[PDB]
Structures are given as C-alpha cells and as structure tokens.
Amino acid sequence: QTERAVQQVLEWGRSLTGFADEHAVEAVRGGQYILQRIHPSLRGTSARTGRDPQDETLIVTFYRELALLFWLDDCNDLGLISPEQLAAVEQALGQGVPCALPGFEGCAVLRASLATLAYDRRDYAQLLDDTRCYSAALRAGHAQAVERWSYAEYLHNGIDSIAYANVFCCLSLLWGLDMATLRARPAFRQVLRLISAIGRLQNDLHNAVILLLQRYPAMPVVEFLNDELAGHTRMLHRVMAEERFPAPWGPLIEAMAAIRVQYYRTSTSRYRSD
Amino acid sequence: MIQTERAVQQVLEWGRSLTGFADEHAVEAVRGGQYILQRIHPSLRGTSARTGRDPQDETLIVTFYRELALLFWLDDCNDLGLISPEQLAAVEQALGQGVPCALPGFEGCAVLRASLATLAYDRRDYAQLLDDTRCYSAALRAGHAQAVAAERWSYAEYLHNGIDSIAYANVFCCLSLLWGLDMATLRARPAFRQVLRLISAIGRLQNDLHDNAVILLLQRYPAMPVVEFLNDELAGHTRMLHRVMAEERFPAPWGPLIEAMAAIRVQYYR
Ligand SMILES: O=P(O)(O)C(O)(Cc1cccc(-c2cccc3c2oc2ccccc23)c1)P(=O)(O)O
C-alpha cells in the first residue's frame, strides 16, 4: 500500500542530509507506476526466480533507489548539500561503502541492502557502475552553464543523467531479470539509449530547450525538440517490433516510454501559502 | 602496392559484370581506397607477421577496392535509378545474404561475395559485412523515400539513417576481413561501437554540409540557422570522438584508421 511505502522511504531518507519529503513521494509515485504496469509480465518470471512481485522488501528497496536518484539530482541542481558532501556521498554510493562524512548513513544502508538482495550479483556491480556514471553526468551538465555544449554532447550526457539505466538495473537486481546477459546484446543497448533520450527530452520539455534557444535565438527550439521526441519514439518503436526481448523487458521499456514526468518529479513539491 | 591504373582496370574488369556499373565507380573506389590504405600502411606492416596478410597483397587490395566500388555503384543505383526496383531488391538480397543474385545481369555480386568469404581471415567479419550491407541498403532506400515524403522525418531519424548510409562500418569491416584486424572482438567493447557511430556521424555531417541534413532542416524549420547548427553538431561529435579514442587506446591500426576517416574528404575521390 502506498503510504506504508512512502513512509518507509521517508524513514530511510532521514539518514540523508538534504532529503526532502518530495524525494520519497516522487519515487513511490513513479516506482508504483512502473511496478503495476509490469506486474502481469513479472508474475511469469516469478516462478523461475522466486522473486515475488509484491515482495515488500524488494519494492521499498526499489523505491529507495529511485528516491536516491531524485535526491542526488536536487543535491546537484539545488545545492542542497555542499560540494564536499556531494563528493563524499557520490564516492560512497559509487563503491557501495558507507559515506565518510556524517549525516549520510542512508548510503551504507541502501547499498548494503542492494548487495544482499541482488539476484545476480553482477547487477550489483553494474548498479555501482551506473551510479558513478550518473554522478559524473550530473556534474557535467552542471558545469555546462558555469562556450556551450553541442546538442549532441548534451543528449549524450543527458542519456546518462536521466538514470533510466540505473532504474532498469535496479529492477533486474531485485527481480532477477537477467539484464547482465541481455546488455551484451547490441540491440538491447540501442533501445536503452533510445528510451533514455526519450526520457531526457520529455523532461526538459518542462536543459535542452534553453540550451538551444540561447545558441539559436531564432530557432523554433520547442517544435524541434518535440519532433526529436517524436523521432526517437518512432525509432524506439521500429526496433521494438524487429527485436524480441524476454519478459518483462518489452513492457518495462514501453512503460518507461509512456511515463511522462507530469506523473512524477516536476509536479511534486511541498506546499506553501504564497 | 599495385599501380593505380592497373587497380582501376582490375576493379572495372569485375564491375563490368554489374548492370549500371560506370567507369567512375572504379576510379572513385580506387581513389578512396588508396587514401585509406596509404594511411594505415605503417600499422599493417606491423601486424603482417602475426596475420600472414601482406599490406601489399594485390589480391587483398583489389578485393577491398571492389567492395568500395560496389558501394559507390549501389548508392548510384538507388539515387539515379540505374536499375529497376525489382533488380535493386534482388541485388540487395544477394549482397545482404551472400547468395547469387536471382535476376540476371548482376553476376559480379555473387563473385565478389564468394571471394570475400574465401579471403576472410576471421569469418565472423564476413557475416558482419553481410549485416552492414543490409543496413547500408535499407538506409539508401529509406533515405531515398525522404526527398519524396512530404512528411520528412526528425533530425534524430535522419542522422541515425545517415550513420548507416555513409558506409564506414562496411569499410572498416571489409578491412578487418582482409587484413585480420580483429574487429569482431573489438566490437565486444562499448567504447569501440561508440567511436564507430561517432566517426560515421562525422562522415555523414561532413558530406552533407559540403536525403540531406541541410535541405531537411531548412525546409522544416526555415527560420533556423541550420548550417550553423550542423557545424556545431559536427564539432560536437568530433570532440566526443577524440575523447573516447584518447581514453581507450585501440590496437593498431584502428587509431590511424579512424583518424584517416575523420580527415578524408569526399572531394578526394568523389
Ligand atoms: O549513402 P549516401 O549516398 O548518403 C553517402 O554516405 C555516400 C556513399 C556513397 C558511395 C560509397 C560510400 C562509401 C562506400 C564505400 C567506400 C567509401 C565510402 O565513403 C568513403 C570515404 C572514404 C574512402 C572510402 C569510402 C558512401 P554521402 O555522405 O556521400 O551522401
């Protein structure tokens, strides 16, 4: 049930300086969307793996990772914590060890849990790898407005900063979806890149838009970026029809394709009178 | 390393078994081919003891030029309609599956593919070449429909298609096949596949600036300074390319080879 999950995510978040109620709320809202969409496809691999779709311990863990990502994003974008603290935190999460600075016990707790629950431990090292990649991508995008990046470099970094690769890997880790052997597949790698680019753009259309408008003030940036979103969605579809991926990968990917951020992140923020 | 005109005649001798083949196809193929071989020659000298493949082996060289000539010819068949839709499909099936062409007039197809299979150092490169051929073929036609769509596609789709249509993957794969450059193993790396997409994107953007990116963007977003954008993009891909090449040091002759392609000008042969 929703509020039990939100509160367990929230409770863990108190061991993270800068954590906000919204980080836990956006996480459970997005996570629930993904888990229920893939539920039926997840029941079939359920006998094989023994990983039960409604395993409370697995759900809350998946939501915590999601909250972790939203939090890190804000930390990076809003200065919620200092740059020294962000470095110690990212360093810890990237190796799966406790943070060296006080106030971030949640890093040790979550990585320890992920290690323990890993179906195929190769997913755990991959998640650590994806975590380091995410951190660097967040850094890079930030250092980019403090000349400019090209649309191509932006999108290349954006694919890593949208963290869809981390989301999929955490799902594989908890429900034994064998992403570790699937990624060796060129076409799987290619759609993962497409789905991410779709995510980065869907979000920014709520930054690529500003980046472009500054470079080419006379360019119809919004129409363009909207055509790019349509384009990627079409390429994503073509490939989806020409490749067959074991359950629940097909649904998972399409589930990520439809999830608009309006269902998460930039919609959730604590209320104030104003 | 075999004289230029003799190589041209060698290529032309085979090209004559392909309907629509023109003298210019053989010439361009030898020109581009020589440019590439000259720039990776120091490396190939180094790997030749291990592989037994001589940088100057005339059989290897002409075969490489014949494949380039095949690619130039196919582009023209597609763009200028040198052969019928039916004939192009039959040719693309033969070259893409590695079997004889089912329609007459294209004997050169089965002949070239058979030599490549036979000459392959690592036969996985031959299978990869058939795959790249299918990708190239599909991209040439899809790209063709575009200047006739009324419903042009996104820049994303254009570049993705242009990466395949520029054929650098085919060139690299054909070189690996003939000189034993172990491309099938290097592809296991994520960073190698990435530089492959990058250098191809660079080739597509360069050829177009000099289905076409400019024409596409201009008539879709007419107020956008498309040429400014594209040049930025190209410098963008170039920076990314240098990055990866620097980080991972690919075995010889891949560095010199990728470098040579980033620098090659469609004007040096076309
Ligand atoms: O498929 P498109 O017509 O879109 C294009 O990629 C062109 C092309 C036509 C014919 C052959 C090739 C290709 C094929 C074989 C060899 C070589 C090719 O490109 C180069 C460059 C340098 C050396 C050899 C080759 C590329 P373009 O960038 O010139 O439009």
Distance from CA of A193 to the nearest CA of B (A): 12
Resolution (A): 2.0
For residue B88, give both structure tokens.
Answer: 């192009």
Cα B217-B223-B228 angle, rounded to 5 deg? 60
Q: Is A152–B220 a contact, with Cβ atoms under 8 angstroms apart?
A: no
Distance of CA A32 to the CA centre of its chain: 14
Element (H, E) at A142: helix A121-143
Cα distances from A8 to residues A39, A59, A68, B130, in angstroms, run 21, 10, 13, 54
For residue A14, give both structure tokens.
Answer: 């108190």
Task: Give the residue extent of every domain in chain B.
Answer: 1-270
Count of CB atoms within 10 A of residue B53's CB? 17
Q: Does any CB of chain B come closer than 8 Å to the CB of residue A226?
A: no
Is there a cis peptide before residue A248, judged by omega within 30 degrees of 0?
Answer: yes
Cα B177-B180-B186 angle, rounded to 5 deg? 90
A chain contacts of residue B239, beta-carbon cutoff 8 Å: 150, 153
Q: Are B167 and B29 in contact (CB under 8 A)?
A: no
Q: Is the dihedral of CA A66, A68, A71, A73 positive or negative?
A: negative
Q: Are A5 and A27 in contact (CB under 8 A)?
A: no
- Please state the φ and ψ torsions of residue B32, each to the nearest 5 degrees: -65, -45
Give every CB contact of residue A130 below 8 A, 6+ residues apart in sequence.
Answer: A163, A165, A166, A169
Q: Does any CB of chain A come closer than 8 Å to the CB of residue B193?
A: yes
Distance from CA of A78 to the nearest CA of B (A): 28
B212 Cβ inside 6 Å of ligand 1: no
Cα A263-A264-A268 angle, rounded to 5 deg? 115
Alpha-carbon Rg for chain A in angstroms: 18
Give every CB contact of residue B150 below 8 A, 6+ residues apart in sequence.
Answer: none
Q: b vs e for B163-174, b when ≥16 Cβ sit within 10 Å of the residue's Cβ?
A: bbbbbbbbbbbb
Q: Are B180 and B53 in contact (CB under 8 A)?
A: yes
Q: Are B18 and B69 in contact (CB under 8 A)?
A: no
Give the whole-angstrom CA distance, residue A102 versus residue A5. Answer: 26
Q: Are A163 and A69 in contact (CB under 8 A)?
A: yes
Distance of CA A123 to the CA centre of its chain: 15
For residue B232, give both structure tokens.
Answer: 């930025």
For residue A248, give both structure tokens.
Answer: 């629940």
Please name which of B237, B179, B169 lies closest in space to residue B53, comparing C-alpha atoms.
B179
Give every CB contact of residue B226 below 8 A, 6+ residues apart in sequence.
Answer: B213, B214, B217, B218
Cα(A163) to ligand 1 centroid in Å equals 36
What string of DSSP letters covers B146-182?
A: HTT-SS---HHHHHHHHHHHT-HHHHHHHHHHHHT--
Q: Is A235–B193 a contact, with Cβ atoms under 8 angstroms apart?
A: no
First to last CA, chain A: 32
Q: Number of helices and strands (H, E) in chain A?
A: 15, 0
Q: Are A215 and A148 in contact (CB under 8 A)?
A: yes
Give the whole-angstrom CA distance, residue A203 versus residue A76. Answer: 17
H/E/C letters for each residue in B201-228? HHHHHHHHHCCCHHHHHHCCCCCCCHHH
What string of DSSP letters covers chain B?
A: ---HHHHHHHHHHHHTTSTT--HHHHHHHHHHHHHHHHHHHHHHHHHHHHH---TT-HHHHHHHHHHHHHHHHHHHHHHH--S-HHHHHHHHHHHHHTS--SSTT-HHHHHHHHHHHHH-SSTHHHHHHHHHHHHHHHHHHHHHHHTT-SS---HHHHHHHHHHHT-HHHHHHHHHHHHT--HHHHTTSHHHHHHHHHHHHHHHHHHHH---HHHHHHTTSTTS-HHHHHHHHHHHHHHHHHHHHHHS-PPTTHHHHHHHHHH--GGGT-
Give the whole-angstrom CA distance, residue B143 versus residue B157. Answer: 10
Single-letter residue type at B11: V
Give the whole-angstrom CA distance, residue B235 versus residue A152. Answer: 10
Single-letter residue type at B22: A
Please name which of B82, B78, B203, B85 lies closest in space to residue B144, comparing C-alpha atoms.
B78
**Residue to mutate (ligand 1; options B21, B92, B166, B212; most atoms within 8 A of CB):** B166
CA dihedral A19, A20, A22, A25 (to 10 degrees): 50
CA dihedral A194, A198, A201, A204 (to 10 degrees): -130
Which of B156, B190, B235 lies nearest to residue A231, judging by beta carbons?
B156
Q: B23-51 and B254-263 are packed helices; what angle lies between their axes, rounded to 10 degrees?
A: 160
For residue A50, give both structure tokens.
Answer: 């023994």
Count of CB atoms within 10 A of residue A91's CB? 16
For residue A34, give both structure tokens.
Answer: 């993904």
Count of CB atoms within 10 A of residue B77's CB? 21
Count of CB atoms within 10 A of residue A254's CB? 16
Give every CB contact of residue B51 below 8 A, 6+ residues apart in sequence.
Answer: B121, B179, B180
Q: Are B174 and B64 in contact (CB under 8 A)?
A: yes
Residue numbers followed by a gap, chain B, C–N over 2.5 Å: 210
Q: Are B232 and B173 in contact (CB under 8 A)?
A: no
A chain contacts of residue B228, beta-carbon cutoff 8 Å: 216
Give the whole-angstrom CA distance, residue A240 versus residue A245. Answer: 8
Protein residue closest via CA to atom 7 of ligand 1: B166
H/E/C letters for each residue in A146-197? CCCCCHHHHHHHHHHHCCHHHHHHHHHHHHCCCHHHHCCCHHHHHHHHHHHH
Give the whole-angstrom CA distance, residue A177 versus residue A192. Answer: 15
Give the whole-angstrom CA distance, residue A85 versus residue A72. Answer: 11
The DSSP 8-state label assigned to residue A120 in this structure reads: S
Protein residue closest via CA to atom 24 of ligand 1: B32
Q: Are B99 and B108 in contact (CB under 8 A)?
A: no
Q: Are B125 and B60 in contact (CB under 8 A)?
A: no
With 0-12 / 13-18 / 19 or more C-beta atoms within 10 angstroms meaning exposed / middle / buried, residue B149 is exposed
For residue A201, give both structure tokens.
Answer: 């753009």
Cα B210-B212-B218 angle, rounded to 5 deg? 95
Give the whole-angstrom CA distance, residue B119 versus residue B179. Answer: 9
Q: Are B2 and B61 in contact (CB under 8 A)?
A: yes
Give every CB contact of residue A47 below 8 A, 6+ residues apart in sequence.
Answer: none
Please name which of A205, A272, A266, A213 lies closest in space to residue A77, comparing C-alpha atoms.
A266
